[PDB]
Design a protein around this nucleic acid. Sequence first.
RNA 1: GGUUGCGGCCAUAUCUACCAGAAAGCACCGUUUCCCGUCCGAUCAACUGUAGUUAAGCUGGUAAGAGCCUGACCGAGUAGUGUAGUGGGUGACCAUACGCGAAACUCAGGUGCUGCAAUCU
Length: 171
Amino acid sequence: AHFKEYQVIGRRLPTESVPEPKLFRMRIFASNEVIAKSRYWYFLQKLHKVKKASGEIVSINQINEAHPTKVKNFGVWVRYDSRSGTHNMYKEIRDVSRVAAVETLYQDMAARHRARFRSIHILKVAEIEKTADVKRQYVKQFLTKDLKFPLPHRVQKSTKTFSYKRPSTFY
RNA sequence: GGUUGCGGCCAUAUCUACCAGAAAGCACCGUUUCCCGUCCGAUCAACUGUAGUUAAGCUGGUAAGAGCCUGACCGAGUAGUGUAGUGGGUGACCAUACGCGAAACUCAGGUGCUGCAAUCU
């Protein structure tokens, strides 16, 4: 579904010798809470000696975008598995939210490298609104002062199967 | 607490090399008339409590000791693996989901514990 940024705070189960464990937290983009808690145990199993059975999740929360109607430059660092091996890349994309850029990121990763969600780890989603922090020319071109372009060859959708005049693609 | 006899678990007890051991206790031990097998009273058998021997046995301590034992979010949730998909990949194989989960390695700690009957300044 629509990716939602969840904060997931969990810990290892409290034993007698070690009450109050170290309370690790992650921000993971997921469709829903069930996948959020699942993705949490998957990564926390990767960085620590803990699995779902031996730990508990102490807080699950949604993080909302601070201002969902300002467009920003998002610096995305990702590792993914291709058929041959593993690679780390830094991509970047315009958006208004962290989540929709991550939705965009998974679409681009699937399209350009045939990477399924199973294969992708989102290392760090970073926002910058200051130029010269933007490295990719496919994003720099929308930051030129006084941007303006046409939308040539406008194709208009037809509700009916027949029309009674050749179409016009003017704009 | 030492020691002896009988033990239990059977190295946290073994192994190497040094250092120490008061009283209690093997025996430094001494002897061959007697029971007792032989080349050998060395082992084994029997007889004594002697110069007074702790030299050895034994016990303890030491050693960035070997070994052994215990533990660890140490490696490592790794390897492996139960279940699942009309997942990926030509394949070889791999990723993912729900579970189980090592061994090496590394780091620490530990040098037997203990039952019964006696005996001991």
